[PDB]
């Protein structure tokens with residue numbers, strides 16, 4: 132975990148390599164051919180600087196940081212745009228964040244889940260509701 | 265009588281893990297991976313098993329908690345007939361909209377160790393955060409205190425809370441006039457019991473044992489899997505770079521095959537034990553979903569299912585990796601003994617009670633309901649007639665007053 | 678099954694995966710050494726297959742027990758357990774056979790069109806409180822009725838709908854109303 136430098140007497144911690152899984156988020160191939168990429172459990176302020184001249188393990192790095200780069204609690208999402216809306220979950224990414232393929236003309240978006248329609252029962256101490264049908 | 269609130273704690277899900285088998289077995293070396301690909305497809309099976317476990321654990325919490333079509337809210341004024349649910353409703357002062365009981369349940373379960381899972385081991389986050397599960401439990405609570413069991417069948421239909429409690433008293437077999445004549449006292453008993461839960465889990469340090477056992481089992485399995493990577497399995501060294509840079513390749517490959525076999529067996533034992541534990545957690549989550557459907561969304565007649573006693577109603581609370589059910593039940597209390605008969609001999613006709621029993625202290629006979637002492641005068645409306653009096657064993661002499669003949673004989677003459 | 682058959686074509690550190698090629702190329706003292714790696718690999722694949730089949734068999738047994746309980750409880754009777762036999766109040770269920778399983782068609786209720794009313798827990802008539810035998814007291818705004826709980830069907834409040842328990846000084850929310858005794862209305866006319 133830690134090593135003393137044997138030349139100058141200070142103490143330095145050792146942190147291992149970042150690494151992680153790469154997930155590809157797609158709709159059906161009968162619908163479209165564009166995809167989004169999730170790098171799992173990774174702050175992507177270092178994904179951008181790790182894109183070098185043929186150094187990273189995945190050979191495809193064409194996406195890089197060409198916009199739509201979003202930080203989630205489940206990792207970093209590239210190729211999907213975050214919106215300030217809430218729909219029913221379509222493709223689960225994680226930590227309350229899902230993705231879908233909708234209009235705006237037609238692209239992959241990321242959002243937080245809506246748990247349901249909002250309701251408020253009109254409670255009173257002297258009122259009832261009774262079905263007729 | 266007595267109203268009692270008990271707690272039942274059920275685990276619903278566990279942690280989601282993913283393993284890179286090539287990184288775990290092979291310490292970023294090209295040729296030891298070349299021996300690893302000679303073994304076929306033992307790694308895709310482990311990957312498929314772990315993904316199936318993770319998807320199942322996401323499915324478990326959605327089965328237990330996501331059972332409302334709409335999110336319900338309490339009215340901004342909160343007076344429910346003297347019943348006082350501030351210990352279980354969420355408060356808005358806290359940044360997390362959780363009840364006080366949920367705040368203690370979050371604080372009690374104690375969830376360099378995270379810096380050691382860096383050998384291909386990754387822990388995935390759950391799909392539903394703690395906030396969303398809290399909004400599920402608040403929606404369930406608001407729907408069950410503002411509508412009753414009506415929102416579990418169709419649309420939510422409002423009813424005052426004492427009328428709902430009278431419905432539930434009729435459900436357990438007691439007339440509802442017992443409620444309305446004792447309401448305040450009944451409310452006070454509820455306001456006692458929901459208080460005591462606040463300390464009953466607090467003084468006891470082993471109350472939340474199941475969720476802590478889930479956390480401890482996952483942690484020790486992960487730590488054992490990491491510690492097994494530093495064993496030799498029949499070699500000079502467990503370090504792959506030292507054995508690579510010390511010997512020639514023809515003996516190096518046939519010796520590191522032993523490390524490959526040992527690490528592969530440790531991975532297989534870990535995956536099989538996670539499969540068995542995932543089956544057990546799936547069974548527990550199915551039981552928790554059944555109790556949420558039957559104890560919370562309705563009133564249950566099954567004995568000892570929703571707590572000890574006669575079930576009145578239940579409340580859900582969320583917990584780390586689980587759920588806590590607060591079961592409110594009706595327990596009988598101070599009882600008296602009387603003499604009883606199966607029938608009454610009046611005019612050569614036997615009278616049986618429509619509902620209730622015949623009781624006597626020694627002088628007179630009365631008809632009472634079975635679960636509460638409320639004696640009433642035996643009339644022809646309380647009893648029904650069947651046969652003569654020579655067939656029933658234990659029939660006694662008494663009189664049965666007709667409330668029609670007396671008024672006719674008074675008013676006509 | 679495809680994984681188990683495809684696993685048969687790997688070497689496990691031997692010269693070849695074909696056993697007859699190993700026997701037809703080498704002398705027996707080296708042939709046994711080459712065979713033992715294949716034997717260990719194929720035993721390991723068979724044991725993993727049997728263990729995973731046992732786990733899946735337990736998982737199928739649990740759902741088969743659940744389906745047997747659903748056939749006993751939803752089809753051969755009517756169940757009061759909530760959300761066991763579908764959504765709503767249970768009426769019936771029908772079985773259908775499917776490849777490797779069963780499909781249950783659950784017939785249930787949904788209450789559809791609701792109306793809003795005002796309620797009281799009791800009725801003050803003559804210094805005596807009246808509680809409904811079955812149903813609730815319902816006012817549209819002017820008159821009061823007794824209905825059943827799951828369907829709106831108003832009826833005139835009589836002594837055949839309610840029962841009497843005590844006076845009118847203990848129930849919180851009791852209201853003024855009249856209660857019609859159907860004996861006195863008949864007995865005050867034919868006698869005179």
Ligand SMILES: *[C@@H]1O[C@H](CO)[C@@H](O[C@@H]2O[C@H](CO)[C@@H](O)[C@H](O)[C@H]2NC(C)=O)[C@H](O)[C@H]1NC(C)=O
Pocket residue numbers: 255256257341342343
């Ligand atoms: C119906 O609702 C009102 C408002 O919610 C109730 O008023 C509460 O009454 C209790 C005692 O019965 C007090 O402790 C509360 O402070 C009151 N809340 C208020 C004024 O906001 C009231 O009980 C009900 N109406 C009637 C006529 O009794």
Ligand SMILES: *[C@@H]1O[C@H](CO)[C@@H](O[C@@H]2O[C@H](CO)[C@@H](O)[C@H](O)[C@H]2NC(C)=O)[C@H](O)[C@H]1NC(C)=O
Pocket residue numbers: 263264790
């Ligand atoms: C109870 O609901 C049914 C529908 O389930 C109503 O029947 C409809 O009545 C309207 C008015 O006559 C017709 O236009 C529809 O065609 C009927 N639908 C069907 C499927 O028959 C019925 O009227 C309702 N009853 C009340 C009193 O509201």
Ligand SMILES: *[C@@H]1O[C@H](CO)[C@@H](O[C@@H]2O[C@H](CO)[C@@H](O)[C@H](O)[C@H]2NC(C)=O)[C@H](O)[C@H]1NC(C)=O
Pocket residue numbers: 348349350351
């Ligand atoms: C419901 O119960 C809570 C206790 O959980 C009551 O809150 C107490 O109120 C008194 C009077 O203001 C304070 O002295 C206490 O400190 C409060 N306790 C807590 C834990 O905050 C609350 O008043 C009750 N509700 C009603 C309507 O009376």
Ligand SMILES: *[C@@H]1O[C@H](CO)[C@@H](O[C@@H]2O[C@H](CO)[C@@H](O)[C@H](O)[C@H]2NC(C)=O)[C@H](O)[C@H]1NC(C)=O
Pocket residue numbers: 265266449452453597
């Ligand atoms: C039924 O039991 C309750 C206790 O659960 C009794 O209520 C107590 O009665 C005594 C005597 O008057 C009081 O000192 C207490 O304060 C009461 N407790 C509460 C919570 O109100 C009740 O009296 C019993 N009923 C009968 C008929 O014996």
Ligand SMILES: *[C@@H]1O[C@H](CO)[C@@H](O[C@@H]2O[C@H](CO)[C@@H](O)[C@H](O)[C@H]2NC(C)=O)[C@H](O)[C@H]1NC(C)=O
Pocket residue numbers: 625626627628
């Ligand atoms: C058995 O219980 C009943 C309860 O009503 C008692 O019956 C009444 O007792 C009083 C005593 O003063 C009499 O004035 C009433 O006429 C009785 N009622 C009827 C309907 O007869 C009865 O006394 C109790 N027995 C004992 C031994 O206490």
Ligand SMILES: *[C@@H]1O[C@H](CO)[C@@H](O[C@@H]2O[C@H](CO)[C@@H](O)[C@H](O)[C@H]2NC(C)=O)[C@H](O)[C@H]1NC(C)=O
Pocket residue numbers: 609660661
């Ligand atoms: C009260 O019940 C007793 C039995 O416990 C009845 O006594 C006998 O009843 C039989 C059958 O009617 C008669 O033949 C006998 O003559 C009765 N014995 C006596 C000693 O009278 C009795 O009839 C019942 N009724 C009354 C009003 O006492």
Ligand SMILES: *[C@@H]1O[C@H](CO)[C@@H](O[C@@H]2O[C@H](CO)[C@@H](O)[C@H](O)[C@H]2NC(C)=O)[C@H](O)[C@H]1NC(C)=O
Pocket residue numbers: 817818819820
């Ligand atoms: C509450 O329901 C009763 C049902 O009888 C209504 O009373 C009747 O209303 C009709 C419509 O005007 C009249 O023709 C009848 O003569 C009324 N009957 C009686 C006995 O008065 C009553 O109007 C309803 N109230 C409201 C406000 O809708």
Ligand SMILES: *[C@@H]1O[C@H](CO)[C@@H](O[C@@H]2O[C@H](CO)[C@@H](O)[C@H](O)[C@H]2NC(C)=O)[C@H](O)[C@H]1NC(C)=O
Pocket residue numbers: 801852853
């Ligand atoms: C109707 O209910 C009211 C209360 O809402 C009763 O009115 C009170 O009755 C007592 C007992 O007779 C009187 O002492 C009070 O003066 C009454 N209060 C008021 C404000 O007038 C009433 O008795 C009930 N019955 C009838 C027929 O009106």
